């Protein structure tokens, strides 16, 4: 997925990450970074030296139960599942830019 | 009655105009086909379904490498309307033992031997 992130906010991603809670992580694959009065675009990704996005793992949980019901009429066809997918919450801490333009 | 169709061999005889339209060289032809299923076998006869199963094109848009030999060529001629055939070309050599892990099919048919993720 592509996320429009800024500093201080939260992102919910729908799977596990094999990280502990509180771990700080560098979010690579930055394709746009914009401030007031200017914007930098990648083709398709910006350079490693240019942008640096940091995110900390804040919560490892599961989703609310999702019902998967299958039904067909006049066929005695009825099935039901409940699924809870894993989820990780990431807090974006900082987005730094370097003069290497 | 609907039956299997036998194709005249004059269909599979390229002209110099065809050799100009496509980049194939009638001398030293290509060893391997890349074949990709691009059409479902539903509403198609059971023999075409079986031939697709034998060729291993059960999954659509998944490339499979095959020989350029008459037996498999007849097999492909049976279901030629459901698939795409391209030559497999090797810009570098064949994959070696120490470069077998880092390879990529790299559509346009060029099986590249080294696969970095950096711009040139």
């Amino acid at each position: 997925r592509q996320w429009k992130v800024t500093s201080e906010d939260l992102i919910l991603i729908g799977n596990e990450l094999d990280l502990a809670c509180g771990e700080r992580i560098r979010l690579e694959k930055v394709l746009l970074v914009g401030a007031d009065n200017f914007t930098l675009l990648g083709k398709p990704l910006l350079g490693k030296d240019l942008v640096r996005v940091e995110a900390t793992v804040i919560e490892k949980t599961e989703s609310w139960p999702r019902i998967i019901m299958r039904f067909r009429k006049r066929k005695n066809f009825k099935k039901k599942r409940i699924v809870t997918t894993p989820q990780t919450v990431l807090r974006i801490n900082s987005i730094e830019i370097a003069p290497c333009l | 009655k609907f039956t299997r169709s036998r194709i005249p061999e004059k269909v599979f005889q390229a002209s110099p105009e065809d050799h100009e339209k496509y980049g194939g060289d009638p001398q030293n032809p290509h060893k391997l086909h890349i074949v990709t299923r691009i059409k479902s076998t539903r509403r198609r006869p059971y023999w075409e379904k079986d031939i697709i199963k034998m060729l291993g094109l059960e999954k659509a848009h998944t490339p499979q490498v095959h020989k350029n030999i008459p037996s498999v060529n007849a097999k492909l001629k049976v279901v030629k309307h459901l698939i795409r055939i391209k030559p497999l070309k090797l810009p570098q050599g064949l994959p070696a033992e120490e470069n077998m892990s880092n390879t990529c099919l790299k559509s346009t048919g060029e099986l590249v031997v080294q696969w970095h993720l950096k711009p040139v």
Binding site: - | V11, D18, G24, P70, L76
Partner: protein, 94 residues
């Protein structure tokens, strides 16, 4: 007022359908793919006498593996450990 006899798309009198630009273009591009397939199926590499037995050994080995799998069928082994550790059902403080 514009009424078609029963089951529009079957029978003697049917609702007419006409071919748009989409359908013609789709047919033409699939025909182009088929023509390129005809081209690439025109230059074989081993002329059908040179391919007489170049894979016989490997196909024989594959079927030998298939037969080995088909004949290596037997009930699994039975261990004292499972029967004895079913006793753990009533393991109290110790």
């Amino acid at each position: 007022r514009g009424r078609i006899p029963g089951r529009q798309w079957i029978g003697k009198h049917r609702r007419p359908r006409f071919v748009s630009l989409r359908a013609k273009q789709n047919m033409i591009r699939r025909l182009e793919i088929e023509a390129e397939n005809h081209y690439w199926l025109s230059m074989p590499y081993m002329t059908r006498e040179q391919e007489r037995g170049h894979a016989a050994v490997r196909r024989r080995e594959a079927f030998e593996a298939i037969k080995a799998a088909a004949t290596s069928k037997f009930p699994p082994h039975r261990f004292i450990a499972d029967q004895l550790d079913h006793l753990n059902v009533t393991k109290k403080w110790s």
